């Protein structure tokens, strides 16, 4: 049981599995770029995205916190709060 975690590696993994999902564009997908406001995809597929991150990293995130992710940088904020991802 030794998983190593860091900031930019998990930023890479979150950004990677957002890039792999199809109906977004890989062109204008910044690190801090929104979900609803600029990409334009709706709420329901956003919660399917949240489902993808939960199914990847091995812990549920709650519905109280599921309202407010909205961009990949804030997602990396909340996951780094979960696993305490600093040195």
Partner 1 sequence: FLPSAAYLTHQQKVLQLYKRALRHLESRCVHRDKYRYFACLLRARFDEHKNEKDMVKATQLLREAEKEFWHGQHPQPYIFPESPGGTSYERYECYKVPEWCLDDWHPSEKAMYPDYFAKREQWKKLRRESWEREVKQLQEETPVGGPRTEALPPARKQGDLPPLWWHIVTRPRERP
Partner 2 sequence: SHITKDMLPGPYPKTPEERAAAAKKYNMRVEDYEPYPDDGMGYGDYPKLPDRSQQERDPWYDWDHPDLRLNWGEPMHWDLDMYIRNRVDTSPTPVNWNLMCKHLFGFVAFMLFMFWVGETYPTYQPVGPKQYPYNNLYLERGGDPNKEPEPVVHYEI
Say if CB 72 and CB 53 are below 8 A apart. Answer: no
Selected from 66, 71, 73, 77, the binder of partner 1 by CB under 8 A is 66
Q: Which residue has the tokens 């860091």?
A: 6
42/7 Cα distance (integer angstroms): 28
CB 28 to partner 1: min, Å = 25
Using CB under 8 A as the binding rule, whether residue 70 contacts partner 1 is answered as no
Binding characters for partner 1, 18-47, by CB under 8 A (x = yes): -------------------------xx--x
Provide the 3-class DSSP secondary structure of residue 33. coil
42 in active site: yes
71 phi-psi bin (left φ>0, alpha ψ -120 to 50, beta other) = beta
Residues marked active site are found at: 42
The site for partner 2 (CB under 8 A) is made up of 62-65
């Amino acid at each position: 049981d030794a998983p190593p975690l860091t900031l930019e590696g998990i930023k890479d993994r979150v950004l990677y599995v957002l890039k792999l999902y199809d109906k977004i564009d890989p062109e204008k997908l910044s690190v801090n770029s929104h979900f609803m406001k600029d990409l334009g995809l709706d709420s329901l597929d956003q919660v399917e995205i949240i489902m993808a991150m939960e199914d990847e990293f091995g812990f549920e995130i709650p519905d109280i916190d599921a309202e407010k992710l909205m961009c990949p940088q804030e997602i990396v904020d909340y996951i780094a709060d979960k696993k305490d991802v600093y040195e």
